[PDB]
A paper describes a structure:
The voltage-gated [name] is responsible for primary K+ uptake in Arabidopsis roots. [name] is functionally activated through phosphorylation and negatively regulated by a potassium channel α-subunit AtKC1. [name] is the first characterized hyperpolarization-activated voltage-dependent K+ channel in [name], which belongs to the Shaker K+ channel family. Each subunit can be divided into four parts: the transmembrane segments comprising S1–S6 and the pore loop; the C-linker which contains the helices A’B’C’D’; and the CNBD.
In total, 181,714 particles were used for auto-refinement, yielding a final reconstruction of [name] map at an overall resolution of 3.4 Å. The model of 3D classification displayed a 2-fold but not 4-fold symmetric assembly at the cytoplasmic domain (CPD). Two pairs of diagonal subunits sharing the same conformation are named as Mol I/I’ and Mol II/II’. The pore domain of [name] displays a closed inner gate, with its narrowest constriction formed by I285. In Mol I/I’, the helices B’ and C’ of these two C-linkers are pushed into a relatively “straight” helix. By contrast, the helices B’ and C’ from C-linkers of Mol II and II’ exhibit a “kinked” conformation. In our study, loops1/1’ stack against “straight” C-linkers of [name] and might affect the downward movement of S4. The two “straight” C-linkers may sterically restrict the conformational change of the neighboring C-linkers, thus inhibiting the opening of the pore. These structural findings may underlie the low-activity of [name] in the basal state. In addition, four phospholipids are built surrounding the pore helices of [name].
Numbering used by the authors:
A (entry chain C), C (entry chain A): 6 to 14, 48 to 510
B (entry chain B), D (entry chain D): 49 to 510
Write the structure that this text describes.
Amino acid sequence: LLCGQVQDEFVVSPYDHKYRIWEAFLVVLVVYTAWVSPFEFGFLRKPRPPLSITDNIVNAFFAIDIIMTFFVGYLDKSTYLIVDDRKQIAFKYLRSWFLLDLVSTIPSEAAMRISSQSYGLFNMLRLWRLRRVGALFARLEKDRNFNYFWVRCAKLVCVTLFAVHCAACFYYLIAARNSNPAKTWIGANVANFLEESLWMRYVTSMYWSITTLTTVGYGDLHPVNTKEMIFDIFYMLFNLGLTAYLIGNMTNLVVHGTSRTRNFRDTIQAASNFAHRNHLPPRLQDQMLAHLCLKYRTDSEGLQQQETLDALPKAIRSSISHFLFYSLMDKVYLFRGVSNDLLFQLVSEMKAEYFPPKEDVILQNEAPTDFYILVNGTADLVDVDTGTESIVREVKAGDIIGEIGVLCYRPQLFTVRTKRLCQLLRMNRTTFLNIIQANVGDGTIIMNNLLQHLKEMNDPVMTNVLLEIENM
Amino acid sequence: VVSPYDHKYRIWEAFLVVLVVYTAWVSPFEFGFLRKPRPPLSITDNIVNAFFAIDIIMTFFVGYLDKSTYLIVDDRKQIAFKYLRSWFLLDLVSTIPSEAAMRISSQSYGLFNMLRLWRLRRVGALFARLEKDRNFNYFWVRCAKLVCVTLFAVHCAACFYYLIAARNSNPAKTWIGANVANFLEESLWMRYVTSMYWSITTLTTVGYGDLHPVNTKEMIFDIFYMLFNLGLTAYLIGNMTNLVVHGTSRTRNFRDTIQAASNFAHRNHLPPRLQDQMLAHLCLKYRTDSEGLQQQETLDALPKAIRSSISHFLFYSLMDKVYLFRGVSNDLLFQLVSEMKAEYFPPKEDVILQNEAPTDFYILVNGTADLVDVDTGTESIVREVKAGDIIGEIGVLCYRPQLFTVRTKRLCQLLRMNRTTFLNIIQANVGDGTIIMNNLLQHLKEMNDPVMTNVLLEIENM
Amino acid sequence: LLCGQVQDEFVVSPYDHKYRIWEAFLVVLVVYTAWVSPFEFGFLRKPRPPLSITDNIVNAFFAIDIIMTFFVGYLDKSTYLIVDDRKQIAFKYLRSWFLLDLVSTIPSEAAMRISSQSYGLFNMLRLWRLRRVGALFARLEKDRNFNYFWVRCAKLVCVTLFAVHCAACFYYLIAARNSNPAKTWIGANVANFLEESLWMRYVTSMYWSITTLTTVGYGDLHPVNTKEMIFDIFYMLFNLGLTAYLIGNMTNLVVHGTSRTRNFRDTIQAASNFAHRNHLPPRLQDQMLAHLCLKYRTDSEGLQQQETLDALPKAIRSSISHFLFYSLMDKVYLFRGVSNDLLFQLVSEMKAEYFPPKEDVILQNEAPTDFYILVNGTADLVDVDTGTESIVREVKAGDIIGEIGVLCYRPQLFTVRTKRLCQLLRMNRTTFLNIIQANVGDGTIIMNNLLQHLKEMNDPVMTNVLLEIENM
Amino acid sequence: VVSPYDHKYRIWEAFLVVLVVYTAWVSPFEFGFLRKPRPPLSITDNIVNAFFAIDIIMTFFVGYLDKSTYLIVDDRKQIAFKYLRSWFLLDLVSTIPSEAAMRISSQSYGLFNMLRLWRLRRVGALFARLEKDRNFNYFWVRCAKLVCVTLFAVHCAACFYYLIAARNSNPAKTWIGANVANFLEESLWMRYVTSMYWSITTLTTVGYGDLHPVNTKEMIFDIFYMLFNLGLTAYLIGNMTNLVVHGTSRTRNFRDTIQAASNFAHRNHLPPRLQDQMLAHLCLKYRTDSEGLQQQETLDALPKAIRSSISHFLFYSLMDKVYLFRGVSNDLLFQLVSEMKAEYFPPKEDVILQNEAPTDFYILVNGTADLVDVDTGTESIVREVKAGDIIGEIGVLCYRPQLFTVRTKRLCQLLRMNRTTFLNIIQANVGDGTIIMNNLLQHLKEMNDPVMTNVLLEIENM
Ligand SMILES: [K+]
Ligand SMILES: [K+]
Ligand SMILES: [K+]
């Protein structure tokens, strides 16, 4: 019960802290300009002081960014190194985006000087600064410290808010830039717009955009002339896909999060209900559920370890195995006095594994393929040669399992049952023979083996007698 | 001192849940539609506050479970000094009677009454507990939680929107003032119904057209309300999709399993005499729920040792009743029962053919079978075999083609043990082989059926 | 290319035909009454001739069904047999549903005779006949001949249509049963209802119900008084969940249908793009994609066969194996002259398998565990003992593979490579020894083996020479 | 006779696609808004009809692919007798000019012009072909097909609804007559725009309120229209959900793989010196797309024989350039290259440590590495090793602790050969061991680095 509950539960680097803390500051300005540019494009025809001053400030900041970005190295994809070549940095920045960044920094006063018909379509050029938020969202998605669900939710919220704002600004622009204002969507409802506060018109247009996007459609503020009808047709066509995309993303976030818990939940629910019904055992039913809980943990760790390995080079896997098991392997009785390099080679190919309690790692009278070594827990040696399952000896962490059968090429002697959650490490017979063959120190192993057979009475002696007869 | 899980405390929590629901409904209503204590309701508010005061004084005497506690921590400190440091002040400010707050200030009625919403932690904890239960489905309580939060959102939005309408001078030029002439001179029931109708119309994205925002404050509120509505609707649709996907997998799995089996049968061009039988067996396996496939899907995941004990416990009383195993041993029977395979057979099917090669002998557990013998086109019934009886054992022990065809009558569950495995086990324990042989010999005493068998064997028995 | 395209591409039984063709006929009457009862409950207060006559006819038909169902046996869940016991049939029908079926058959004239205030709520009792459509849908879902997608779509369509009809009838009933008709949802729009055609009122109410369900909400025909507001509140509250359920079902039908296409699609897309890029081979890249196509077919069939088997009793699996392989194994050279029963026992435990072309079923110098037999295709015998991969002999369908190593308990002789899609069947060494031990016919096998060693020159002879000294 | 896949025929089909789109747009428009041939458009209709007549007379000369055909069937019969028996009559009735149908009857203009919609089989076949392509995504063409059918449904509904409005006497008391005073006395453009606006408003479930059905015919049509709309919206949402689910699995897989690796590293309490390296390796392997993980995910699924030939072809020119293998053999090199493991290393890392146990020697394929030697805290660069060169071979062949630390400069791909495997391979072919040894000995002639090694080995070489 307790276990089951637990289971359920002067250039600069592009990575400097002083540069990352400043690049992220430009996201605030990107948000500000993304809000301002459609509002200025729709509701304003001439630069007003309280907005023009801030626009000039932001343009100066982005010009500072442009003049600074020439001193920032990048990471080559074919080298994974900082380029640190001012010749290459400039010829990459110019080819990637330099004129687009430049045109998005000219103050609106200069645009008006060129032509008064401008300053509407010129402010929309400042939307080019929206690549920074996309790059930031990509980095956040490819980052571990930030939750995927909240990142996706924030991205969706930003997208829908920007769409609402842009649509509202465009639709109010269509309303205002029209003779006979009484024949417009807002002129047929208020009948006195272009005279009251800008805040009222902004909130009215935003309310219309929100009602149209969420498909509420109250009925006030509806298109009258043909241009508004066409724009609203296209807007609703976009909104259908936008809502479908939002629903799909929400479904995707809702699923695959609790999905991998449900396999465990139902595979244990079947066991629990089968135990509860059909002559419920007193305590055996409690034993089996703990075994299932341990197995679900064992295979997951046995798979995560297998997944993270076999994808790394041998040079680092060998180092990891040496860090984990070389110290423990020094206590192995067979490898006593052998050359030190052979120990390293053996450790580098040990293939650690895990086993649930009451599991038969080796069964009696089987083909000799592998020999095991204990790391954690303990196991009991049993044999059915006498007709009964009686234990012979208990092996603790630090002894070999079934080494007699593999060395002498004969079927195993005793069935090994792990009375506890045991971590083992097994290496094949063919690999052992290959390693021994490409070496000169191998007599010590057989001397240690034969010495060990003497310490056990009459169980190995028959095998020892056979080996002595077979050696001659 | 009392411990959790007690039937005098869980019932008390379940009773406090309905009071929490009452508070969650009432507090926004008094915040929006009410100004004075309104004795029609302040007495009930005081009653609920007294009940929650009883709870807050009672909670000092209840234990809890820590990360590694022994299922209970029954002391004064470490529970009094834990509760006071988590939410004591919030649970105390949210139970002060509204009558007292009037003396402090007369304009804080609704604002102070909205503090009672802190009691929703009870509902949150209940939903969290039901999420990790066994008798209740997971997605079916997730959807209930979504429905509850949707209803709460609708009620809160309606109350806030009517508050915005009422707290504005010149009641005309408002969402309710433009439709209803003088709403302020009408019953509270109809105004509440109208506000709730508007809230539901906005939430379900119907938007009939009546009761729409007029001034800027209502538009500003409604924009955020609609954004929250879109988010909530998307989340609810996702949860419903997950519930549907994970709530009908059994039928799809059965369908695709049967389709794959039929494709396999067709690929090798098996005769229909086999296809019908395998289809019937598979339909029986995937139709009997919690007994047919459950036993296999459970015992398969055991490491041949725990399931051995399971079969020993589940098949010992029936095993000891057979005549073949009378006085063999108390561990040989353990090995025997651990070396059996459980099988099921649909009715009107034969498990043993007459004059077949003797390879298996069965032990009946449930149901009945008829020992059908044929002389010349006559399926004369010899006798009926009941539960807890052995069949087909005389052909495998005494090597000979099978005597009688065993056709099943009802839905039966059989235990099958291989001849080779039984011979290997018997050869390993020769001492019980004599017991088995004499038990078989003494049983062969019925009318003229095995009489020649004893004599024929005695020819080679010297 | 071609292979890849192919891979992508007087009682009666309750099962009598004359009874199934009549029970399905009652579904038409169930649909008719499911349409009529809400319409009669809302739009009609007294039994009109053209509807009362048909209602009496349908009631007579259902009374005939009631009086006939006493002569139909059922299938017991604990027996899976037709009960055929008229004593038990009646005591099951009465306990399950007899009074509910009876009350849903009384003609409406009798209900009016009891009280004129009735005949509204009495017609809604006829909705009890909706269990038949539910049972039919369950049977269709549990049936193979009918597509799951279309059954689910039809069920959803029926549910939503019934909801629309019931809501429309209830809402028109609320409108009509009210004094001062000018203060109703339909009285404020038409202002002359209760006087024009019933068809107009029915279609108007249905149009309102459809507009409310699909969340269009044009604006005409909206609630006015409090009762209509409450009913509409509850109706839209139900509609939200109904639409969520429909969307969830549609998503579930859309996914899991093309899902198991995409694993193959992307696992072959990766291979195709890797072959196209990075020094595309002339024809080797064509060879590997065919191997992947064959493997995707091989493991699928190898899994479907494994899934359908191991779930059936041994008595039928043995019969299937005997039908498939007993005739073929008669040609096996080792089992010539052995007792016939031993052949049956061997056939019962052969565990047939499949292998893609250019696959090594047995590799040289491995532990002797299994020996194989060919069924289809052919394989080539290769050995690296000479330092090169040179074929020695080609084995056709009907010969054993690696039988020398398993019998003599020595490492295998030659690596076996399947030059074509080969179906094999392998059985273990321990099983073979157990089968041989529980028998008396075994000398024939070893004599046949030794005779076979003489037909091959100097390759088995060294092993045969060792065996001659090993036997002594 | 011409065969499919020809660039003079596929282009022709792609050009007919836009004509099919034009017909699909125009035919409902003329059915609804038009009565007479309207020469402003009948000339274009006749042009398109002539083009489709050219196509229908041309299709007698194009082959096809059957179930087991040899990619083409170029005859007169079995293609003429197949096309004439499948859709010849439909493709001929759907190309008769509308001028001819006027003589038959003047009231069948729109009904006969609606028969041109049969040409949508071209778009259907195009979408089916694009579904089973390689350069185009599957869900991204499914969504395009859904968008196209949604647009077609909107257009058809708008045309039908305006036809219903116009074909009714007393134009007032209609959905457009109640809003627009005299719609029949206004331009076709504005009427079409209004009808399309109503159709889009109904489809997106906005329902502003203007242009609503008045009489019973419009209500009856609109009920079925809304039901179809609900079905189409549900299907489109399902398809979009499937696209989203199957379009972002790569990022989730990378995230969960990195999370699992970090959990494994933390569980065993590895030092950071290993955690950073393994995280860098995993990020590099999951970041390099189409070259890093693609090679492993491809070669892993090969049965050790085809991938052997792949490595033989991909690693023979570079292998033959090494000084160690000059005149060794033409099959031993095949075995060696088939017995190599491909590995990748991020820059600024060391693959061989100085004075380590000699166990592997590498062959560089791409990138550069620096042979770093340290005397006393001085990482003096000895020399740079380029692509197609062997490293660390002097320590494994001549058993000795490694001489120089090989630190990588760029992103490199290496081939690793195990000392034990190489020794076993060499021992199997002794005649080439002499060649390998003398090739090694002759190379040992640089300045003072291996001079003592040659002498020291010659001490034991007698
Ligand atoms: K809507
Ligand atoms: K709406
Ligand atoms: K509306």
